[PDB]
Design a binder for this molecule. Structure first.
Ligand SMILES: [Ag+]
Ligand SMILES: [Ag+]
Ligand SMILES: [Ag+]
Ligand SMILES: [Ag+]
Ligand SMILES: [Ag+]
Ligand SMILES: [Ag+]
Ligand SMILES: [Ag+]
Ligand SMILES: [Ag+]
Ligand SMILES: [Ag+]
Ligand SMILES: [Ag+]
Ligand SMILES: [Ag+]
Ligand SMILES: [Ag+]
Ligand SMILES: [Ag+]
Ligand SMILES: [Ag+]
Ligand SMILES: [Ag+]
Ligand SMILES: [Ag+]
Lengths: 169, 169, 169, 169
């Protein structure tokens, strides 16, 4: 009766908790991509920066869902952040493909989370997700898709090096 | 045929009119809380300011729904703004509890209003409500909930005085 | 022969990988402490901010070890970031105690890592750790210890609320 | 009894003298690399600038060890700065490989010098070396290693030309 929870279904709460984990996970994947591209034998500084920034943004995404959980009076429950699937992510194209797949996985998760909120008639949650995640995911996915297109266009070797400069700066 | 109304159902219009009254009412409650806390024998200036600001914001909420009504080509119809339930709101905790209850009542009303708009497939109204009210209500409720938590933590007497300073400044 | 690795023992590399995980873990603990203190029923904003900042700094610590790993030509290998031990961290004192314990655990780990580097005659690694971690840990631990002292001094209730204001601002 | 020497072993002094020569030598190598890349028939201005800067920095490294020698009350003793091993350093990759080898040779020398100081319990010398040389060497080596990686990635011809632009600016 002194708590803030209102119109916030347990499934949604749990879906937010899952999404928190997912965003941390994606953060972690990108951290790993970043460090891969900062290997002396890979040495793609643009990719490194790009994936670091993506890692940091994923962390922010997580945190904003954490906040949301608290703002709705849910209870954040953390789970392990699983290690990413690979220790080495290949070429920039390989990693961008993996990133695209991750973002699509995150995006589906968010869409599922939105479907949850819509199912439970939580329009504030829906709005939150739309406002902070959905278009962002769309943008990210489109952006990575274009990267893949240009990576392919640029080709291996020099093209990769030059394309890599074009990430960020 | 020269009017702007389009896709704006009479129930929604009426729901906006009810919500207008509700926001004015909440404004009025907060006005009363404010004046209570500015009694010489209550004299909690932070609460006074906080509730005045909440009153003014509720008024703005009302006005924005008035505007919306007109922008959608509905017709604003005012009702009495009922006096608040109490003339004296007790301690800061008591008033914060009452505020929490009011905000939850407003919030449910808004959620009902959004459900109305969703039922009548008025996505512009839905968006309006989400954009201007829902998250705001969530924020308000969470904020007041935290106040209650801290009021309890701080305890009566000195704690109330000190907590009161922490509202606003 | 085109790689940068020099004087960087496999044990050290592995110790850095462990330390990376540990810093991420500590980051994660602090994230959880932060969100605990942002519960509507806990609502200690200073603690929230303090633990968020500690989480972010732990992340930076991790990242700097990631960087170091790459700068020394080791290979970062991530592991799961385990969920923290608790879902709810108690009072600010309880959490500060837990933080103190975590920082001491991190600190011992770092000291072990430094002992590793010293054992393997990796003075650059030693210096790195001393330059970026050791004094920082000392500072953190002392700082948290003082917090605990003041939390105790301040007492539960009002004291906790007031002490909480004194974290950060 | 009016001199400053204290806790500065003759071997260390001699090791500093050797290191001075080594840094001058490395300076000289880089000078030669620089001039190679400024040949009209080589004409890689980025490499030229990069190696000039590396030459100048190596000179500064030498000078700082000279200073250190004097600050510790040792006696600087110069030896011939031997001419570099090659008159022509090949492609940018070839020279970067040679640079990597030189920096690793310098780095080992410094590590040996640090081991000397540690053996003789000269922590000020150890610190000096750690503070001014070790991490710098690590950085240099990693940097050159990445260059080699990117030179390889970029390939001969156009890639070399483009990679060359990416040194410095
Ligand atoms: Ag819900
Ligand atoms: Ag990384
Ligand atoms: Ag992203
Ligand atoms: Ag919306
Ligand atoms: Ag919407
Ligand atoms: Ag309608
Ligand atoms: Ag008033
Ligand atoms: Ag309000
Ligand atoms: Ag080592
Ligand atoms: Ag948090
Ligand atoms: Ag810390
Ligand atoms: Ag000595
Ligand atoms: Ag020259
Ligand atoms: Ag150098
Ligand atoms: Ag040191
Ligand atoms: Ag040291």
């Amino acid at each position: 009766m002194s708590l803030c929870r209102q119109n916030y279904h347990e499934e949604c709460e749990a879906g937010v908790n899952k999404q928190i984990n997912m965003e941390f996970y994606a953060s972690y994947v990108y951290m790993s991509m970043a460090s891969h591209f900062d290997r002396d034998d890979v040495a793609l500084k643009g990719a490194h920066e790009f994936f670091l920034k993506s890692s940091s943004e994923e962390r922010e995404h997580a945190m904003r869902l954490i906040k949301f959980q608290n703002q709705r009076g849910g209870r954040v429950v953390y789970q392990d952040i699983k290690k990413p699937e690979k220790d080495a992510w290949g070429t920039l194209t390989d990693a961008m493909q993996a990133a695209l797949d991750l973002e699509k996985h995150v995006n589906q998760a968010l869409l599922d989370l939105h479907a949850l909120a819509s199912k439970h008639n939580d329009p504030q949650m829906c709005d939150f997700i739309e406002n902070h995640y959905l278009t962002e995911q769309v943008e990210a996915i489109r952006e990575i898709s274009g990267y893949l297109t240009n990576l392919k266009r640029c080709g291996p070797g020099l093209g990769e090096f030059l394309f890599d400069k074009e990430l960020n700066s």
